[PDB]
Design an enzyme around this catalytic site. Structure first.
Site, mmCIF file in Angstrom:
data_model
loop_
_atom_site.group_PDB
_atom_site.id
_atom_site.type_symbol
_atom_site.label_atom_id
_atom_site.label_comp_id
_atom_site.label_asym_id
_atom_site.label_seq_id
_atom_site.Cartn_x
_atom_site.Cartn_y
_atom_site.Cartn_z
ATOM 1 N N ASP C 36 -18.302 -57.528 -24.764
ATOM 2 C CA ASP C 36 -17.594 -57.723 -23.509
ATOM 3 C C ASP C 36 -18.511 -58.106 -22.364
ATOM 4 O O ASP C 36 -18.048 -58.338 -21.244
ATOM 5 C CB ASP C 36 -16.727 -56.518 -23.176
ATOM 6 C CG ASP C 36 -15.423 -56.506 -23.974
ATOM 7 O OD1 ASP C 36 -15.131 -57.519 -24.662
ATOM 8 O OD2 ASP C 36 -14.695 -55.486 -23.906
ATOM 9 N N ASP C 274 -4.466 -94.264 10.377
ATOM 10 C CA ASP C 274 -4.869 -94.266 8.981
ATOM 11 C C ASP C 274 -4.048 -93.265 8.170
ATOM 12 O O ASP C 274 -3.799 -93.492 6.989
ATOM 13 C CB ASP C 274 -6.366 -93.928 8.826
ATOM 14 C CG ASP C 274 -7.203 -94.202 10.117
ATOM 15 O OD1 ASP C 274 -8.383 -94.640 9.978
ATOM 16 O OD2 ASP C 274 -6.704 -93.954 11.256
ATOM 17 N N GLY C 409 -6.645 -92.787 -5.777
ATOM 18 C CA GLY C 409 -5.466 -93.200 -6.551
ATOM 19 C C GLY C 409 -4.878 -94.524 -6.092
ATOM 20 O O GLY C 409 -4.578 -95.390 -6.907
ATOM 21 N N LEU C 410 -4.728 -94.682 -4.780
ATOM 22 C CA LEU C 410 -4.280 -95.940 -4.202
ATOM 23 C C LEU C 410 -5.283 -97.073 -4.461
ATOM 24 O O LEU C 410 -4.880 -98.185 -4.782
ATOM 25 C CB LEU C 410 -3.998 -95.776 -2.700
ATOM 26 C CG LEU C 410 -3.623 -97.003 -1.846
ATOM 27 C CD1 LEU C 410 -2.239 -97.589 -2.215
ATOM 28 C CD2 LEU C 410 -3.697 -96.689 -0.344
HETATM 29 S S1 SF4 Z 1 -12.893 -59.020 -29.825
HETATM 30 FE FE1 SF4 Z 1 -11.985 -59.027 -27.731
HETATM 31 S S2 SF4 Z 1 -12.309 -56.904 -26.949
HETATM 32 FE FE2 SF4 Z 1 -13.746 -57.196 -28.710
HETATM 33 S S3 SF4 Z 1 -15.774 -57.838 -27.839
HETATM 34 FE FE3 SF4 Z 1 -14.579 -59.679 -28.379
HETATM 35 S S4 SF4 Z 1 -13.448 -60.238 -26.442
HETATM 36 FE FE4 SF4 Z 1 -14.157 -58.072 -26.224
#
Ligand code: SF4
Ligand code: SF4
Lengths: 420, 415, 421, 414
Positions: C36, C274, C409-410
């Site tokens: 994580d 403009d 765009g124009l």
């Molecule tokens: S599976 Fe999901 S919860 Fe587990 S480390 Fe990977 S992102 Fe994080």
């Protein structure tokens, strides 16, 4: 005769307009044909201006030629003066009027106005816009500036900011803020924002900041001899260039260099890991001399590109540019032919192009990332937002601006490479 | 309260804020797919073409200028020799060009550069593949749209002769507009009708003592004269702006060709209704509003005519760079008799009148627009009226839209 | 289970990391598995930060589950205190940790550290990132702020600026400038730039500037109770909203409004000729509630566009947005599903789309002009250059930024037509 | 001077800065055209994929994540039915998909939903058009590239049986690299050779008692185990990085198929010289430079071997998330003897050793990289190595170029 589609610079009289419009309480009278007023569009549209350019034309046409042309000039001069009561005026010839025999200096002097009228000589068939502005400003300054006692506290002039300058507005604001950090105030900034009475007060400054060589160098040289004022040789575009500039300013004044770097982000952005793919990206650089030289040093020494081609369209900056280009192992491309630019770009096969609006278009055709570093430039490059090219905020601005096209190009290239 | 036939027009001279005829090349060349326009002039002229063309400059347009150099100023033997080399070089690059226009400028005129004679020489040297013409687009001779006029006039004497009874519609119109014009005329039963200029050089109209022509654009004085010199006869009509303008223009053609009222009224009924409906969506904002028009294109009188009658606007001063009485007679008869008419200008005098009138809406060029907006005057920029589809039934609401927009924006942005 | 490709917001604990990373001298400890730490890349790569975020994880994995997971959380709180000697700390659960039985409060009460450790409840299966941030800041302010002696000068707090905030850096700078122009100095700016010690001194300010409701409102509401400080309800994005803001601050303080407009260029820009072609141009606006509401007023009343769709992904902002959309005679699109956005855009056929990085991509696929007004955002929209959305420089920035893609765009359309339609 | 066979490896646990196995999906699905990867996880899992994928997220890619809601947190029966609903939805929305991977996350595993059972059940239901598999990509079980390992290992039981004696080259490679490998092996007289994974589901290799396989990626432990369970036999080789590794890799295969030394030298001569010339350009800035590698992908040992032996770099600490002792033997035998080796990671301690060593170039994750730059250490972000073409001859200079670049940018900017 040269067959011409694109031109990087207009005629010198447009440069004269570029100096008059920059200033206040000064009227420019141009001897020229009905039709040449189209140049007002430039100042009212591109620069989004709230007033008519302080410019008017004698407006001769087919039914009033011969001895009538001289009279129209006189009318035009007298009418401009009676209406706006300026502190001073300037008179010049358009390209068409250059083939007539009328003497603006003779005509203007016989009129014997209560303010000075400065006659300008602008060869419209050999010289161009940048010379027009540079010479107009020099003539104005030669007529108006006088030796004076130096101000009690250390001050300087800003020289060469004009109307229709690429980011002149915000460069002026940014350079002011960084001289103020060293305890140096601006005496007069000219042409831009100056009146002829301000020009009369130039001599009381200690030295000059020459912001744009293409539009201020002559006035600077004059002020050096006439007012014993030194001028800065280094243009503060780039972090490295800004330091040398402040070091130069320190040598001139004796004051120590003080900086506020709390807001300088370019060096860390460039040092960060997300910038290491920029290393060796091949960059081709075109535009005016001042901006090309400045950009080259940033590309090579601040961002880590390989400068792979280098040149400019203005002959007046040929030698500083040729001197600059050789340090990169390059021969300078000096040309005002966009088709020649297009040949040099194809041969160099860059990954990025830094240029003018012409170069943006060459870059579109070839499918290459491009960013704009120099005039000529359409309405887009006169922004409502703060957008200096100079000093520390300018270093930040330049970084975002050059890198954005590269990320867009890679991002579009990755998208198409995983669909099928 | 309609009719300015006997109205005194101000003939004014002095400082002018107008484009030269070179400007006309920009939207003229788009129509003549086969032609190239070579201005012989200065960098000034090149700069103008660049400014007026804006984005089109990057799209390899079929025009360009031979910029006179200092060496070209001292001797006329050298210049005609240089122009030839410059032409041959240009024509080798672009083999597909069939018509070359050498366009006179103020610098080429003062220099006494004989472009008439050059056009004849080059025309000899490049036959039969490319015909080369000459005309002036100088500021000295010409204002904005008068550049189209001088162009078309220059090619009238060279047009095929014929005894056929056919209609010519004069004025370069946008392609969709032209198509509508043609459709409407065909539906009416009007036999073969050609435009001047044609889309290509090898389908230009023929002219003869039985040719009829009608003008889609008011600025066609010299072309008119040249067609009459060839024997043709003009059909007089107000210009085809709006439902009424367009009806009257068609009507004049119909009447010339003996087309029945039954056929006219039934061909015209639905497009007439369509256009009336589209204009009405702009009345709320436009009705009772006062109009001031600076001189630019010669469209201002017929446009003012449309704005007053079909949009309930009120005219103040309406100015034109040139007022051709015979060509403008039908429209002048329809203008509100209060209208102050001007031909020409002394710019500063006109701005002083303008400031006094304090008009609700002001048509003017880009030189005056922002300056006027800064003093609190609502403006509509003129040049858009030359290059947007505006003529005939289908563009009648869009025509009105061009004028309601600036007044609607003004209201949106400040309570 | 909702099938998900794009997500406008992350999990609440990233919100917690937004608050921790904005701050100095606070450690945030998260109970979560190995892996994580990927979220660290967001603060290091995108915000281009020059330090590791003050965030550490207990780092549990399969071989060490069971009664070890509590030990691991304990070790990480201890290790983070011993190494960084913070003034205060926060502890919270990752989404996987929320499925476990360990109580972050009782673990840290037992550890008995010499600084406050603030437990955070973050419902990771029902709430998202913005809520994580709004809650975390609220809890930190509840923990640290106290009734206090008001400062002699009129001061205020800036409330809501965080790490990973869209233009937070420069919004803070610009707001500070317009307050200084009225002689109002800032007391503390939080979370962005503040320390736990700075948070103790919140109460002495006269009032609060609520810069971003999504990440500051809950804290503002607390400070209204605890320290009797009322908070600004107007977000100074757009010229008009900036004026309405300054007017509001006038009422709260009693001080007259003083502005510096020497550099305010947006009004003249849009009034100039403009800009006339800009009238009636159909715009679809999407992003977080704050930026969508602000953007819509600019579009309609300052630039002269017709607002043709409005919506936000930010459910906490659903009501203000629905209310605001009614004014434009629109039904507000409240959705976290980019596919719904794509349908609405198609059904409205706008000429300009204002939104998120996702809306950039939808727009490109449809070949429609588009500008970014709201997070989530890729690297570029975290610029080296000065780039506020707020105040008078914000107004200038917003004008250039919205108009540029239309002129592109124009321009593109004109020269494809020029050769040779 | 060049033996690490017996070097005692420091095994560490603690705070880690590494990616979970879900990340592998990002460049795996690009290889397997017929496949779709459905994660069962939280918003965190979807957020990671989004971050890991960058602009690929906007390219309608063949992965996604069924994100858990409150309702799903209890209990089993209902969740499984809810999964089927989403899977049935997905399959009709994209019918050109023939392979569905149910990927296990940390949330799903703590919840104990049996994805193995769901795969079984959905396979029965969507047969014969869609086969569905299950493997773990969770942070609990897996680190970054190990996600490819569990994926391929989950495919092996079900591959076709064969008695042919064909070669299998295991590990997802960029197509440009794969083609080169095929060509070199084909012109050596070795055929037919197949890849695992293959580009489409209908051309997966067959396995049986006569099959030989060789690993192109170091992180293929479970896959190796699975192929051996079906009777396939491994060809041991150091990993094909640089001139030497590629040659040695290729040599092991040529030895296994009886190819002569005469053929080997002839097919291999030109690509060899070409590879070592491309590398020479980078020998200037790299020779003598100290190297430190944080653990990320299990490429660190082969890569350190290549950088020392072919680029003249000195090694210091070379760390890896997992070290398979048998698979890594050939490369370990080539590493310089001074190398300190680390399996696993304890971040704060490993950052203290790093600081003390003060190495010239550090390979580490994006989360470490800038903070280390700020402290004056030249870094090289690791993740690039797993997605850029780097194996075999034609890419050897580019690979060297990946490590010389940050060093010449540091020199250029100061
Ligand atoms: S599976 Fe999901 S919860 Fe587990 S480390 Fe990977 S992102 Fe994080
Ligand atoms: S007015 Fe004359 S000199 Fe000026 S641009 Fe036109 S043709 Fe050229």
């Amino acid at each position: 005769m040269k067959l011409t589609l694109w031109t990087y610079e207009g005629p010198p009289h447009v440069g004269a307009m570029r100096v008059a419009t920059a200033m206040k309480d000064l009227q420019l009278v141009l001897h020229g044909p009905q039709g040449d007023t189209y140049a007002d569009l430039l100042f009212t549209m591109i620069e989004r201006r709230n007033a008519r350019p302080p410019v008017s034309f004698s407006t001769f046409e087919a039914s009033h030629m011969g001895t009538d042309t001289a009279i129209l000039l006189k009318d035009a001069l007298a009418a401009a003066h009676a209406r706006y009561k300026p502190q001073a005026m300037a008179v010049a010839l358009t390209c068409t009027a250059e083939l007539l025999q009328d003497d603006p200096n003779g005509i203007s002097r016989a009129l014997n106005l209560p303010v000075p009228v400065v006659p300008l000589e602008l060869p419209s068939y050999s010289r161009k816009e940048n010379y027009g502005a540079d010479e107009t400003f020099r003539a104005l300054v030669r007529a108006l500036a006088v030796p004076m006692e130096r101000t009690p506290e250390v001050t300087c002039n800003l020289l060469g900011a004009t109307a229709l300058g690429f980011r002149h507005r915000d460069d002026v604001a940014e350079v002011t803020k960084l001289l103020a950090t060293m305890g140096i105030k601006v005496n007069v900034c000219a042409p831009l924002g100056a009146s002829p009475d301000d020009l009369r007060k130039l001599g009381q400054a200690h030295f000059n900041v020459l912001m744009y060589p293409e539009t201020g160098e002559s006035a600077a040289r004059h002020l050096e001899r006439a007012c014993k004022q030194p001028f800065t040789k280094i243009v503060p575009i780039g972090v490295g260039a800004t330091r040398d500039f402040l070091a130069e300013v320190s040598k001139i004044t004796g004051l120590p260099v003080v900086t506020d770097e709390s807001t300088l982000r370019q060096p860390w952005w460039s040092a960060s890991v997300d910038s290491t793919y920029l290393t060796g990206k091949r960059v081709f650089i075109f535009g005016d001399g001042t901006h090309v030289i400045a950009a080259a040093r940033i590309a090579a020494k601040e961002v880590g590109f390989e400068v792979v081609g280098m040149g400019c369209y203005n002959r007046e900056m040929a030698r500083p540019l040729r001197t600059a280009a050789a340090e990169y192992g390059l021969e300078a491309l000096i040309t005002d032919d966009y088709l020649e630019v297009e040949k040099a770009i194809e041969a160099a096969a860059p990954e990025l192009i830094l240029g003018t609006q012409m170069e943006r278009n060459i870059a579109k055709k070839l499918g290459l990332p491009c960013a704009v570093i120099s005039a000529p430039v359409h309405v887009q490059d006169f922004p409502a937002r703060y957008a200096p090219q100079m000093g520390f905020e300018g270093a930040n601005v330049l970084f975002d601006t050059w890198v954005h096209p590269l990320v867009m190009g890679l991002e579009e290239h990755l998208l198409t490479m995983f669909r099928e | 309260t309609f009719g300015c036939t006997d109205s005194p027009v101000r003939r004014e001279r002095g400082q002018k804020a107008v484009f030269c005829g070179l400007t006309s090349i920009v939207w003229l060349h788009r129509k003549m797919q086969d032609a190239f326009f070579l201005v012989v002039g200065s960098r000034t002229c090149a700069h103008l073409l660049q400014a007026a063309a804006g984005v089109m400059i990057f799209a390899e347009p079929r025009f360009g200028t031979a910029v006179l150099e200092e060496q070209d100023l001292a001797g006329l033997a050298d210049a005609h020799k240089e122009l030839d080399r410059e032409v041959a070089k240009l024509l080798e690059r672009r083999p597909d060009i069939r018509q070359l226009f050498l366009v006179g400028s103020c610098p080429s005129e003062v220099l006494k550069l004989d472009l008439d004679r050059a056009a004849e020489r080059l025309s000899g040297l490049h036959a039969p593949h490319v015909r080369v013409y000459s005309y002036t687009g100088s500021g000295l001779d010409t204002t904005f749209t008068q550049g189209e006029d001088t162009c078309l006039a220059a090619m009238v004497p060279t047009l095929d002769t014929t005894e056929a009874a056919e209609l010519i519609v004069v004025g370069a119109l946008p392609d969709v507009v032209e198509d509508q014009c043609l459709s409407l005329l065909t539906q009416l039963g009007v036999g073969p009708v050609r435009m001047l200029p044609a889309r290509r050089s090898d389908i230009e109209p023929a002219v003869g003592p039985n040719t009829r022509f009608i003008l889609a654009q008011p600025f066609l004085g010299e072309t008119t004269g040249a067609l009459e010199r060839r024997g043709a006869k003009r059909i007089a009509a107000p210009f085809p702006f709006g439902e009424e303008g367009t009806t009257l223009w068609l009507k004049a053609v119909a009447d010339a060709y003996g087309v029945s009222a039954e056929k006219f009224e039934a061909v015209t009924a639905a497009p007439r209704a369509r256009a009336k409906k589209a204009i009405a969506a702009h009345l709320e904002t436009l009705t009772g509003k006062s109009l001031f028009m600076f001189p630019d294109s010669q469209l201002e009188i017929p446009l003012a005519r449309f704005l007053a009658r079909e949009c309930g606007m009120k005219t103040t001063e309406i100015a034109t760079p040139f007022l051709h009485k015979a060509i403008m007679a039908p429209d002048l008869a329809l203008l509100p008799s209060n209208t102050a008419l001007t031909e020409g200008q002394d710019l500063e005098a006109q701005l002083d009148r303008h400031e006094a009138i304090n008009p609700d809406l002001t048509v003017c060029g880009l030189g005056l627009a922002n300056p006027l907006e800064a003093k609190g005057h609502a403006t509509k920029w003129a040049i858009e009226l030359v290059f947007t589809p505006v003529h005939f039934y289908e563009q009648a609401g869009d025509l009105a839209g061009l004028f309601s927009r600036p007044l609607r924006r003004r209201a949106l942005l400040n309570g």
